[PDB]
């Protein structure tokens, strides 16, 4: 959406993945209602029709990933970071996917000496992880490098 970097797109694509439970790139009105029921709240089957036809610019009723990606620009989070931190994450992130791993922090500590064991590396992530996946986002990494 004309400003989106490689990080937020790699986060939104994984966010599109667990939200879609048939493997393709089409969000049906039904499979949106599958997630909504798991939030405890119930749909009304017209609320599902409300949220799809809000942004379905092509007119198919199935939310494709470009129409999903410009939707998260409307419901945007924010853009406030530093240019040195975003470069520092791409040095750490080896396989270009917008996430740091347990084996991608044992590499960075090894270059700095530091003699880390496998147990503290999993204890670093538990203070870095917010949503609870054992996998540091970009927003989880910016939140640690300047704040706590």
């Amino acid at each position: 959406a004309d400003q989106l970097t490689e990080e937020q797109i790699a986060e939104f694509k994984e966010a599109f993945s667990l939200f879609d439970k048939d493997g393709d790139g089409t969000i049906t009105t039904k499979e949106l209602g599958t997630v909504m029921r798991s939030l405890g709240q119930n749909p009304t089957e017209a609320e599902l029709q409300d949220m799809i036809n809000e942004v379905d610019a092509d007119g198919n009723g199935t939310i494709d990933f470009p129409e999903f990606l410009t939707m998260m620009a409307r419901k945007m989070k924010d853009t406030d970071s530093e240019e040195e931190i975003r470069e520092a994450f791409r040095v750490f992130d080896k396989d270009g996917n917008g996430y740091i791993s347990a084996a991608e922090l044992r590499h960075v500590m090894t270059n700095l000496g530091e003699k880390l064991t496998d147990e503290e590396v999993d204890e670093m992530i538990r203070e870095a992880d917010i949503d609870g996946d054992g996998q540091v986002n970009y927003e989880e990494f910016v939140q640690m490098m300047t704040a706590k």
Binding site: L18, V35, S38, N97, T110, E120, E127, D131, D133, M145
Partner: protein, 650 residues
């Protein structure tokens, strides 16, 4: 011979700049100078086809230095200006349309397509070919440029004005091959989905994501060989066929028509193992491929690798006991070489198998010669085929255990010669054939998870922190061995005989380096005075300095490469299963997976994986609310700040 290349490219870039200043219109084109272009182009002698140092006209300089106002003046005055590709051995083919594309934004690209542009222009020169060379590989055709610069507005603008979405390259790469081997992977995924949208179901016989290059390799297998983990997860979403979701329990159904080892078509597991580029081994930890190798190893891979680990181990014992019970005959003449230099008292029989004990060995010796030929008929057809030593730069450098087992079956057939032609030196080829023979038992220690990552570490010391040590050992034991020799050259070698011969003085000094003998001491004859000094220096910088530093090198390395060896071990399970699947017949190895004839899914083989997925309400709350429209911590947090100023200050 090869460093003139780096000069001659830099000769052209300065010669290009000099031709700009010694020209009225090119200097006018490098800047805007819109008053000056109208001044010059009303003349007669102005060559508008002026060739610079590469073939550049005024419009290229207006485009490369992105002067769109100077571009409008030149298109009115010169008709054949969207044409005329460059000529020199560098950039060829490249018109003004390519340069307007590569800059990620121009109004010139809307202007040049109006002025009858040329989108078939193969930009084939020595500056658009991938190699340890030019920093970029964007492609050949103008659509291939617009794709790999992240230009979503230009690719839509190219296909409308009569483009070609299918056309290959000199390498044979299509458009979708170029998107895979870019260094910006997540923007390549959005361009991947866009370039398939304008395919519009061509009748072109496997439409454009199955078409191979000149190697013969699909886009799906190009994410695997190169190392694209981001593309390989994206390309897999067309393959899965997810069955049901019983709450927090899914059941997907992957497509093993290109992953699993097929017939004579080289499958995807056969291409990763025979490839460099360490990021390619990251594919072996992916959700259809990790579950495939583990189900080919627990079932059919390990019980066959132990029945070859036991036939070979009963082969060496049959070969060992034919060396222990080898024929010897007592010494003939009578100690003819003089005393104190001769103590051998047996010799080797000419031909004597005439006793019932030797016919038992004759059974055993024929086993290890038949078995020696079989080793040279399953692996030597790879050195018969792929080169002797000059074309054969692949398997020598790749597999260490290839060399030791060809050497073993060579030493047996040296001993086969010397037993028949009745030679003398048979104790030498049986000296190799035993240490070479028993150290291939180390090969059959990769399936056992206990012994697996230990043989990985040994070959990373031999080709690592021991030949970093063996050069600065041979420096020391050529200095001191020539120092201990010349001191004891003027002495009596009958109470201290460690140094009386310069081949011998190399041998005792090497042992004192390792302390695997005691040390020259007599305690009855007053030694030379210089020995007590030069051995005292040799005791410090061998036993106290350089050997304890070698413990510090192997101890520093072993905690650094300590998760790479668990990546290297699980990539040798794949290298074993693929090898065992090939050389064994199909009657013992069932094809892995579930067929699709009787279940009505086609001819392709499937593999079902079920996984209890997840929770984290907190994650999905953040995205559905957008949809909703109208102490060990103190140890860990201390480790974050040591990374924090460790990063922001570098």
């Amino acid at each position: 011979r090869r460093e003139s290349w780096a000069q001659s490219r830099d000769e052209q870039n300065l010669l290009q700049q000099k031709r700009i200043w010694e020209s009225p219109l090119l200097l006018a084109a490098k800047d805007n100078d819109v008053q000056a272009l109208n001044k010059l182009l009303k003349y007669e002698d102005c060559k508008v086809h002026q060739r610079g140092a590469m073939g550049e006209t005024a419009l290229h300089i207006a485009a490369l230095y992105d002067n769109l106002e100077a571009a409008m003046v030149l298109m009115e005055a010169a008709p054949e200006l969207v044409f005329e590709p460059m000529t020199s051995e560098l950039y060829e083919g490249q018109t003004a349309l390519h340069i307007a594309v590569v800059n990620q934004n121009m109004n010139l690209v809307r202007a040049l397509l109006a002025r009858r542009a040329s989108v078939s222009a193969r930009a084939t020169g020595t500056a658009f070919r991938r190699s340890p060379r030019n920093l970029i590989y964007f492609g050949e055709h103008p659509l291939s440029f617009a794709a790999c610069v992240n230009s979503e507005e230009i690719v839509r603008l190219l296909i409308e004005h009569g483009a070609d979405i299918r056309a290959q390259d000199s390498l044979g790469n299509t458009v979708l091959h170029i998107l895979i081997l870019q260094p910006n992977k997540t923007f390549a995924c959005q361009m991947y989905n866009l370039l398939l949208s304008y395919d519009r179901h061509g009748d072109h016989l496997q439409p454009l994501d199955l078409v191979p290059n000149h190697q013969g390799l699909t886009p799906f297998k190009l994410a695997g060989v190169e190392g694209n983990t981001v593309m390989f997860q994206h390309l897999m979403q067309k393959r899965k066929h997810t069955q049901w979701t019983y709450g927090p329990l899914t059941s997907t159904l992957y497509d093993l028509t290109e992953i699993d080892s097929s017939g004579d078509e080289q499958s995807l597991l056969e291409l990763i193992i025979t490839t460099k580029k360490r990021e390619a081994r990251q594919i072996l930890d992916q959700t259809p491929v990790k579950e495939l190798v583990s189900l080919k190893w627990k079932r059919y891979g390990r019980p066959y690798f132990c029945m070859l680990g036991a036939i070979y181990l009963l082969y060496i014992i049959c070969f060992t006991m034919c060396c222990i019970y080898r024929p010897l005959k007592p010494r003939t003449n009578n100690r003819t070489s003089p005393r104190d230099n001769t103590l051998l008292q047996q010799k080797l029989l000419q031909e004597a198998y005439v006793t019932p004990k030797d016919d038992i060995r004759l059974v055993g010796e024929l086993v290890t010669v038949i078995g020696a030929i079989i080793i040279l008929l399953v692996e030597v057809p790879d050195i018969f085929r792929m080169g002797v030593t000059r074309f054969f730069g692949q398997t020598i450098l790749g597999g260490p255990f290839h060399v030791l087992i060809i050497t073993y079956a060579f030493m047996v057939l040296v001993t086969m010669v010397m037993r028949l032609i009745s030679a003398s030196g048979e104790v030498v080829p049986m000296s190799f054939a035993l240490v070479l023979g028993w150290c291939n038992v180390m090969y059959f220690a990769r399936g056992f998870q206990m012994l697996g990552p230990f043989t990985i570490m040994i070959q990373k010391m031999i080709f690592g922190d021991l030949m970093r040590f063996c050069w600065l050992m041979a420096v020391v034991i050529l200095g001191f061995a020539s120092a201990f020799y010349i001191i004891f050259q003027t002495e009596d070698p009958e109470e201290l005989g460690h140094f009386y011969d310069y081949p011998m003085a190399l041998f005792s000094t090497f042992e004192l380096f390792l302390t695997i003998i005691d040390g020259p001491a007599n305690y009855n004859v007053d030694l030379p005075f210089m020995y007590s000094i030069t051995y005292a220096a040799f005791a410090i910088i061998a036993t106290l300095l350089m050997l304890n530093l070698l413990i510090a090198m192997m101890g520093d390395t072993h905690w650094r490469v300590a998760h790479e060896r668990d990546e290297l071990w699980r990539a040798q399970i794949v290298a074993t299963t693929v090898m065992l699947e090939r050389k064994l017949p199909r009657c013992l190895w069932p094809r892995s997976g579930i067929c699709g004839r009787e279940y009505g899914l086609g001819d392709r083989w499937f593999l079902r994986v079920e996984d209890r997925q997840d929770l984290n309400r907190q994650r999905i709350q953040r995205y559905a609310q957008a949809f909703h429209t109208r102490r060990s911590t103190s140890r860990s947090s201390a480790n974050w700040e040591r990374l924090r100023q460790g990063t922001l200050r570098r």
